[model samples]
Target: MKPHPWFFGKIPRAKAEEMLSKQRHDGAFLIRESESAPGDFSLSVKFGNDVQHFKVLRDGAGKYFLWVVKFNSLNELVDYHRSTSVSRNQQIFLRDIE
Candidate 1:
């Protein structure tokens, strides 16, 4: 519910890739609606030329989580990961957004 410029709506993978392409600083990220589903949002991050996609999942409490850690809002989830790493196959972090 916080003013999240990082939390984009229903943008496809390429736009995520395009916006983050400039800020390709290894951790630059954006959360957006996935091409696959409506509600299960995508956490797209940059690691050089490759952008890693992770799911921001919901549960019975309606909290958001990336499997291990969870938060009340998308803002909190992203904020937490900014301080720590977003665990994909490799460790990625949230750096910046446009």
Candidate 2:
């Protein structure tokens, strides 16, 4: 299901940081499969000097949905957050890494 440019499946945290570091955008972000939580995902976003990680969860029904935000699928979830912020404090969206 590697269907998106920003979806870096199985990439670890440090490596993800290196990639986003080059972009240097506040809203810059990437999705990598979680290391500690193997089956789930992480939404790592750059905010000035630091990067924030939001755990992306999957259900038994095969959907990754987050509270305060909701989607039936992974790509759709990413798409929805592009125009809208991840949350009030996050204020991040998926930028063009294409």
Candidate 3:
């Protein structure tokens, strides 16, 4: 996965999505972006012993998006979350962890 301009130290979108996809195949559930409040977008997945959250943000061009992940918590959001990007047209899928 390629790194986005703002990705501080997050995983590449491809690998991140790949991880999400793999987790889905293992029974993880996807939480849509719309589910989050108007000013915020977050998705969650439940794996065997971990629950991860993926948050999306739009880039300046508004042509693509980025994602950040959190584990079992939502109270804190850091620069790491805003550093990732995904192709605008790409489907934002989420799933629970296996």
Candidate 4:
């Protein structure tokens, strides 16, 4: 996904983890995928310092989804979030980006 101009930057892992964990416990599921292909989805968290990006991807059905968390010292995401039924298509990619 193309970076959104509004994105500030990345945040600390502690804060990022806190928000992610809170969202997870609260059942605030974000994006979802429903296809058997390699793809990626992302979310951003703003924690005072900057905006951090969290990414999740699936390359195959039932295969382990690749996760890139705590990237760039600015981006951080905690594990435990699940994908919704919505597929990460081109339109959604363009819409929810940045």
Q: Which candidate is the best by TM-score?
A: 1
How large is the C-alpha RMSD of every model relative to the true structure? 13.7, 13.2, 17.7, 17.9
Better of 1 and 4 by lDDT: 1
For residues 2-34, could you state the per-residue lDDT of candidate 4 as single tens digits?
854433234344554455555423333233232
Arrange candidates by lDDT, descending.
1, 2, 3, 4
Which tens-of-lDDT digit does each residue in 52-88 have in candidate 3?
6667666678644555455465423333334433235
Top lDDT: which candidate number? 1
Report backbone clashes per prediction: 0, 0, 15, 4
lDDT for model 4 comes to 0.40
Question: All models: lDDT?
Answer: 0.85, 0.83, 0.47, 0.40
Runs in model 1 deviating more than 4 A are 69-98
List where candidate 2 sits over 4 angstroms from the true fold: 1-3, 59-62, 69-98
The candidate, 1 or 2, that scores higher on TM-score is 1
- How far residue 75's Cα lies from its native spot in candidate 3, in Å, is 35
| Candidates ranked by TM-score | 1, 2, 3, 4
Q: What C-alpha lDDT, on a 0 to 100 scale, does residue 88 get in candidate 3?
A: 51
Better of 2 and 4 by lDDT: 2
**Model 2, span 1-98: residue lDDT tens:** 76677888998899988878777579899888898985888998888887778898677798876555568998898899889987788888878797
TM-score of each: 0.59, 0.57, 0.31, 0.24
Weakest ten-residue segment in model 2 by summed lDDT: 62-71
Clashing pairs in 4: 9-51, 10-74, 11-74, 32-84
